[PDB]
Amino acid sequence: SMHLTARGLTLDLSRPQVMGILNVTNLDQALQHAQRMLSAGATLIDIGGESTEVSEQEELDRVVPVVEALAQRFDVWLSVDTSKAAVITESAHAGAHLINDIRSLQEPGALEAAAKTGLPVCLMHMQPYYDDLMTDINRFFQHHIERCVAAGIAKNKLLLDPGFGFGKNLAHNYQLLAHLSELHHFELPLLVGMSRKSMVGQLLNVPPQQRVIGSVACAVIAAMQGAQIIRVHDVKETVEAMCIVEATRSAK
Amino acid sequence: MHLTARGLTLDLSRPQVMGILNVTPNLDQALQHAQRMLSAGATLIDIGGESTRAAEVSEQEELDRVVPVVEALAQRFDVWLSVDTSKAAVITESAHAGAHLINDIRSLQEPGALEAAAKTGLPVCLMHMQQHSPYYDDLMTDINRFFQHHIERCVAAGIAKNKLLLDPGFGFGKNLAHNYQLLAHLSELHHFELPLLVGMSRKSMVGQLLNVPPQQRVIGSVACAVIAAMQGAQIIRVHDVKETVEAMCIVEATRSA
Ligand SMILES: Cc1noc(NS(=O)(=O)c2ccc(NCc3cnc4nc(N)[nH]c(=O)c4n3)cc2)c1C
Ligand SMILES: Cc1noc(NS(=O)(=O)c2ccc(NCc3cnc4nc(N)[nH]c(=O)c4n3)cc2)c1C
């Protein structure tokens, strides 16, 4: 029904999009891994310097060369998983397409830097107790959506992530997964990250490397509920699953 | 509710995985594979002496493949045993061996099949079917009319309504568009108030989309299983049990939330 655009490049959101995770914790490995994910069918590459502290220069040193190298190398959406205004701006210079912040630009100067770039930004819900899980998330997004538009970032440039595994217990996560379709009322793209998280592990009683099937199953359930972007470790498997999903949905 | 045979119950509040146990071109290997699938979490084992994908099979030949396996499993394991047969002789003999469920793609239309199946008193699964290019005026209506027709045949024959299972038959006289049309509208078949069994594992509906060989169709098959189970499909017929079982755990947890 819709699409999102950056730097003359467009991301089709009528179909589920797979975002490959590229955590940095060697430049050569990063470029090659990105290549592996891209061929696997990823339409976005997410570069993250923190795992949910890191120094500003240290985080910048890891992130921006990878962004620039990929920007030169491939015509693909580039996303930086950062919460730092310096990293926001520097990545924009490097050629990043999307700003993905788990802290929702609440760090000092982060909001202004993001606004100046004009790049699309993804807002993620974060805190364990909830009176009503879904209501809290809806209220959270509404607040920062109000804030983002106020900052001069257009509403249609925003993405929403309910933030699986962030200040949420096992029951909450699957409650969220079950009611995920409700979040579409914002008429904004939904991005979800469930890959290899505890919500899979606790159920299957398997280590992270054995959580591929569980992660994909979650991705399929989310995508069947209209989730547009899926953030995963295992791109190829997720891409294959999304093909089944898209064929099913297109079949009406 | 549950499905019942010989004092065994199958919980239908949760998705059940039926492991595929083909016995075609050693009993020892079959038992190891079945036990492995059993270990993976399968609650049903489907034993087939015929290939529905094919050269025909003799009555004695199919019997030779099927019944020793059924007898072997019945003693060794407490699991639902399903026989994938269209032959009254195989139906009757397998029932003697201790089979719990009759899975017939041809819906008991072979000679004497209906009568033989009825006498066993065992639950039966009916499957919709149609070189010919698959066409439907309306796929779901055609399937609904098919099930309505054969359900009456079974009931008239003396097979109780609660003993019946319905399979829309993925990949049987259906093209790629048809199969996913069926998957999308699968929930509609619940109106018969009968358990639904689906078989999409490693089938062309996955293969044509991903363009990979059968052994590499695991993820696609699991994706189909999840979608079907989310639409309330009770029994899933798969080659890869462990992966499907893990997926069903995510599905059941999601629904139970
Ligand atoms: C220790 C320890 N390690 O993991 C856990 N448990 S956990 O639920 O699986 C878990 C929770 C969170 C994460 N963060 C990973 C992560 C990173 N970036 C993201 N960006 C976006 N936009 N959306 C996301 O969802 C997201 N998630 C990784 C693992 C414990 C406890
Ligand atoms: C030849 C040839 N080989 O594969 C194809 N394409 S196919 O769609 O993948 C395909 C089609 C049918 C099968 N038969 C396998 C099979 C056997 N018994 C079943 N019993 C039940 N209850 N339900 C089932 O779905 C089912 N499926 C296996 C593969 C053709 C055509």
CATH value at residue A239: 3.20.20.20
| Residues in chain B within 8 Å Cβ distance of A241 | 219-220, 222-223
Comparing CB atoms, the residue among B230, B255, B257 nearest residue A224 is: B230
DSSP letter, residue A233: S
Strands B101-104 and B80-84: parallel
Whether A124 lines ligand 1, by a CB cut-off of 6 Å, is yes
Mutate to test the pocket of ligand 1, among A17, A102, A174, A199 (most ligand atoms within 8 A of CB): A102
Give SS3 for A124.
Answer: strand
Smallest Cα distance from A171 to chain B, Å: 7
* Structural domains of chain B, count: 1
Burial of B12 (0-12, 13-18, 19+ CB in 10 A): middle
Joined together, the tokens standing for residue B66 give 């099927």
Assess contact for B105 and B69: CB atoms under 8 A.
Answer: no
Whether B167 lines ligand 2, by a CB cut-off of 6 Å, is yes
| Inter-chain residue contact A248 with B184, CB threshold 8 Å | yes
User: What own/partner pairs with CB < 8 Å and gap ≥ 24 does A32-36 have?
Assistant: A34/A66, A34/A70, A34/A73, A34/A74, A36/A235
Whether A222 lines ligand 1, by a CB cut-off of 6 Å, is no
Joined together, the tokens standing for residue B31 give 């038992």
Nearest to B107 by CA among B89, B85, B136, B80: B85
> How far does residue B101's CA lie from ligand 2's centre (Å)?
19
Whether B83 lines ligand 2, by a CB cut-off of 6 Å, is no
CA dihedral of residues B49, B182, B231, B161 (deg, nearest 10): -60
Assess contact for B49 and B62: CB atoms under 8 A.
Answer: yes
Give SS3 for A222.
Answer: helix
Joined together, the tokens standing for residue A231 give 């953030």
Alpha carbon B28 to its chain's center: 24
Joined together, the tokens standing for residue A67 give 């962004």
Determine the residue type at A241.
A
Domain residues for the domain of B159 are 1-257
| Inter-chain residue contact A244 with B255, CB threshold 8 Å | no
Mutate to test the interface with B, among A209, A212, A213, A252 (most CBs of B within 10 A): A213
Neighbours of A226 (CB within 10 A): 16
Neighbours of B89 (CB within 10 A): 17
How was it solved?
A: X-ray
- Indicate if A231 belongs to the active site: yes
Matching residue, tokens 């002789």: B89
Kindly write down the DSSP assignment for every residue of chain B, as one continuous string.
-EEEETTEEEESSS-EEEEEEE----HHHHHHHHHHHHHHT-SEEEEESS--------HHHHHHHHHHHHHHHHHH--SEEEEE---HHHHHHHHHHT--EEEETTTT-STTHHHHHHHHT--EEEE---------SSHHHHHHHHHHHHHHHHHHHT--GGGEEEE--TTSS--HHHHHHHHHTGGGGGGG-S-BEEE-TT-HHHHHHH---GGG-HHHHHHHHHHHHHTT--EEEES-HHHHHHHHHHHHHHHH-
Across the A/B interface, how many CB contacts are shorter than 8 Å? 84
> How far does residue A168's CA lie from ligand 1's centre (Å)?
11
